[PDB]
Amino acid sequence: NASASSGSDQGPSSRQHTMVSFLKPVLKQIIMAGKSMQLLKNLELDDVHDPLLAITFELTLRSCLYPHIDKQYLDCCGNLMQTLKKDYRLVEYLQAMRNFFLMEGGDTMYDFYTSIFDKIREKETWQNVSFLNVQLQEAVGQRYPEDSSRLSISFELPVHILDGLTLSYKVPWPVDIVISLECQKIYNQVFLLLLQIKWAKYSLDVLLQIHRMFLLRVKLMHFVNSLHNYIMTRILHSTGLEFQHQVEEAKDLDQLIKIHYRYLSTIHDRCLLREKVSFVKEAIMKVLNLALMFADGWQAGLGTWRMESIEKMESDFKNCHMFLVTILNKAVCRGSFPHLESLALSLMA
Amino acid sequence: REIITLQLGQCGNQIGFEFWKQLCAEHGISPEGIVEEFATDRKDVFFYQADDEHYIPRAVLLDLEPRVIHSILNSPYAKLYNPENIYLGNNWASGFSQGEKIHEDIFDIIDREADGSDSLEGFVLCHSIAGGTGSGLGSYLLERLNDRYPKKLVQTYSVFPNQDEDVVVQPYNSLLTLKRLTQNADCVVVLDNTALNRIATDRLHIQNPSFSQINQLVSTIMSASTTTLRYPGYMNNDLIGLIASLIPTPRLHFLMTGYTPLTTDKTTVLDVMRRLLQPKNVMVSTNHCYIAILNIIQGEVDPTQVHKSLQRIRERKLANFIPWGPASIQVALSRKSPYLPSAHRVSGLMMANHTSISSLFERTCRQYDKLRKREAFLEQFRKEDMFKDNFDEMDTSREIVQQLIDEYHAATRPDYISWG
């Protein structure tokens, strides 16, 4: 939009502005193509119309002019998207918006999941705004051209799972039109929630009446492991992979925006960050936390646990497993049901 | 975070040599350990880096009354796995005391390669159970690593002796190692010789060199099993991370396995899972029940087909296990190796816990109770006698490996509301 070759927000209005009838069938093509070439420039039409009329269906006459603007629109946008695929190497920028940051465990994010979350007590303290960005270095992987900042260390919930880290990444003007700041504001949320799953999973990883710990662990694994494979694979790898083809075929500014804008509002619903929090996300957050609670309880060696509320917390998890399969099966009445019916095959017990 | 191969017993070193030689194929690293001339990737966890361009990984070729490890060293493959550390009876106690007489004299190098690391993460044992001087010594290392480096994982990749019933003191040699394996090592992958020879008769008439050929089979198994760890990925880029769920209890971690193409010389997610769930394709030969399952597959398959495919296996009821509570089966997606040959498009593997390995451990228990009424394989050598004056460590090992049978047969039943 506001790389404006157009006031198409206000000029085309129905009352306090005016619109010309014969241009409408092609006006969208004109505005998009005119943006496209104003923008590419930073990086006889009234005599083609005639030799075509010179060689009674006035409607069809007009409908053999329009191939000229059709062809010029196709040409300018066909040059414009290939330009951003080299001058801003745009497939690589969007890949990197997932691979070394904000999604993929990679090489990178485990060499970081091993640092801040250490247990001398912490590594020092999660609140230290410098330790985060510093330990995010050695982001060397397959390439090291990093430009992000693991900011807002807490930037201030009841759980052992705790809030913060509103991360961000440097994106320049050629790709500010695509990867908007509002897109980024949603792109954090997948990262954070994924981090939580990975850390509750991690804390039931890095451990090891005496068999009852083993049981509570196994019936904890089953859950988190299958959900987590739903996040990393069913929601994130799937949308991350189906995105990667279709960008080749969106072929204009206002096509390649719109594919991407749909894609995030799909991640937002299929991971269910949306306003149906109170039915599912409250439940998933507690059973995410109970795992952390059990991991600080069972200190992976001592055997002096001795305190019986944690067996009621095991019953809490059991009734939570109902809070899960029943409320997920209540979505068949109404809701965003079909990806949820694929989470609701959690095999129970 | 880095991992180290304490390759031990001569069979363990031959399969370790073949495993390294396969990884020389299955990475851009030359036979002489320099970067391969063909060469997105992560050598870091296993290999060294310098202007002295031999990428020599953390290998320690412990050799006793030695023969085969020298013939492994006089290869073109010598300057890959050689930090330069080779240094000098088939009974368990002889192997244990030949370990004792060199223990810190090797552990200096163990530490030196433990330092070939910016942050260390585990030790890996390619091994033959009950085998020779590796009998005793494997259990000896387990009794050292468990107190030397207790936070690090120790995993035993273990061919189990099955030659139709060479080592005939096998029951005595196995039983003390299994006693250590249930207590000291963190996870144990068991491989049957007779099941692998059944693969070496299945895939082609290549059972002729089975004795050696079997080193090839374990290397495709091992390279497959590590293909998640050696590369970027959303999860299982972290070796303890790789194996939490396959261990439901620290008593029971003796993993059985299966391989997808026994032979191949299109297919998709439902047939590979249906194919892995086959006793032909499982590497281990009343009631029997699974406990937890990991499938790992290389291929351009994607999570949409696995989510259907799991329910199709579940409604075909090949998933026969939900024995005392929740019991589960893993997602498998991984990269297939670039720059190197890439046979069979979905050519994955299974790891799993299931109770038929108790039958083989009960077989070697029942061999021990048979030979305990003869004692001929004591041979009256003095170390085997003096180490156990009342024979107390064998008697304690018997009750422990008998309790292993009790635990697995309790795991078969709803008896695990109690202990095993």
Side-chain angles (χ1 to χ4, degrees), chain A residues 68-139 141 145 155-158 162-339:
Chain A
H68 305 321
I69 279 168
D70 156 76
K71 184 54 189 297
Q72 245 293 328
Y73 161 78
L74 179 129
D75 190 23
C76 76
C77 299
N79 200 50
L80 182 72
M81 282 314 188
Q82 75 174 347
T83 291
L84 271 55
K85 289 185 200 299
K86 59 188 179 175
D87 282 12
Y88 310 98
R89 56 193 187 108
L90 191 58
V91 61
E92 307 183 4
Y93 252 82
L94 270 55
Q95 165 76 116
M97 255 301 300
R98 299 193 292 256
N99 171 233
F100 290 151
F101 301 81
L102 285 132
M103 179 192 90
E104 197 182 353
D107 303 326
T108 60
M109 330 287 291
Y110 179 69
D111 283 25
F112 191 86
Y113 304 152
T114 42
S115 183
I116 180 57
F117 303 98
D118 203 358
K119 273 179 172 279
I120 297 175
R121 293 299 175 99
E122 307 309 319
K123 201 78 185 192
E124 176 185 283
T125 286
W126 293 36
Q127 299 285 1
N128 186 331
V129 299
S130 69
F131 199 72
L132 298 172
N133 185 335
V134 167
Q135 289 290 324
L136 178 53
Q137 308 317 306
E138 195 54 38
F155 195 74
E156 300 176 22
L157 72 155
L162 77 80
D163 189 21
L165 298 88
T166 296
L167 195 138
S168 287
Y169 183 114
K170 169 229 60 178
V171 64
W173 168 85
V175 185
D176 174 271
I177 294 89
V178 184
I179 307 291
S180 76
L181 182 48
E182 189 63 11
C183 293
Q184 211 70 286
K185 175 272 212 153
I186 296 301
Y187 227 142
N188 308 326
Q189 313 307 330
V190 47
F191 163 75
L192 291 176
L193 276 272
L194 175 69
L195 182 79
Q196 297 179 14
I197 297 293
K198 219 297 185 185
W199 186 49
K201 189 272 188 279
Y202 171 93
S203 305
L204 282 38
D205 256 337
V206 193
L207 303 173
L208 297 107
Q209 175 65 351
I210 318 155
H211 61 82
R212 197 213 49 66
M213 272 69 61
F214 309 158
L215 287 177
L216 180 51
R217 167 174 177 275
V218 165
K219 64 140 297 301
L220 268 283
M221 310 334 283
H222 160 71
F223 161 77
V224 67
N225 179 87
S226 59
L227 176 62
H228 166 63
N229 293 339
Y230 159 101
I231 301 294
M232 284 290 209
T233 82
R234 188 74 177 106
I235 308 305
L236 302 197
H237 184 217
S238 75
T239 57
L241 180 61
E242 62 101 10
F243 181 97
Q244 184 273 353
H245 146 75
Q246 186 190 10
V247 287
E248 297 181 350
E249 299 195 0
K251 273 290 178 181
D252 179 65
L253 174 59
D254 217 354
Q255 284 181 358
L256 185 59
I257 292 169
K258 303 300 296 204
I259 180 179
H260 185 267
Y261 191 85
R262 289 287 84 176
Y263 151 93
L264 71 86
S265 207
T266 305
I267 286 285
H268 193 229
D269 182 57
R270 263 161 50 121
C271 189
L272 202 52
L273 286 55
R274 289 190 67 78
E275 282 67 19
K276 306 306 170 178
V277 165
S278 51
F279 316 113
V280 170
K281 165 70 194 295
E282 303 269 18
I284 212 74
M285 192 46 98
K286 61 174 69 166
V287 298
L288 185 157
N289 177 46
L290 301 201
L292 291 169
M293 286 291 347
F294 170 74
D296 281 332
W298 175 8
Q299 297 139 70
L302 277 66
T304 66
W305 321 131
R306 296 287 189 190
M307 191 280 290
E308 308 306 283
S309 177
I310 292 177
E311 285 83 345
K312 298 306 88 171
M313 192 168 287
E314 179 155 25
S315 83
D316 183 15
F317 204 108
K318 169 54 65 168
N319 67 62
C320 292
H321 216 84
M322 205 56 24
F323 289 141
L324 251 61
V325 65
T326 44
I327 296 302
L328 278 185
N329 285 1
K330 276 191 178 292
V332 191
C333 322
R334 255 161 293 277
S336 300
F337 44 83
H339 65 81

Side-chain angles (χ1 to χ4, degrees), chain B residues 268-282:
Chain B
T268 198
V269 178
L270 290 68
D271 58 87
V272 293
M273 290 167 73
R274 190 177 211 153
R275 185 179 288 117
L276 283 172
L277 287 156
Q278 294 303 325
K280 166 73 81 162
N281 302 57
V282 164

Side-chain angles (χ1 to χ4, degrees), chain A residues 106 111 114 205 217 225 233 342, chain B residues 42 234 237 244 247 307 330:
Chain A
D111 283 25
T114 42
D205 256 337
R217 167 174 177 275
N225 179 87
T233 82
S342 83
Chain B
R42 193 171 186 181
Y234 43 76
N237 58 6
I247 306 167
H307 221 78
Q330 295 279 20

Side-chain angles (χ1 to χ4, degrees), chain B residues 320-341:
Chain B
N320 52 341
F321 68 105
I322 186 91
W324 33 245
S328 66
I329 183 161
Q330 295 279 20
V331 303
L333 303 174
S334 64
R335 290 168 54 165
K336 188 73 169 172
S337 301
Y339 62 56
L340 71 98

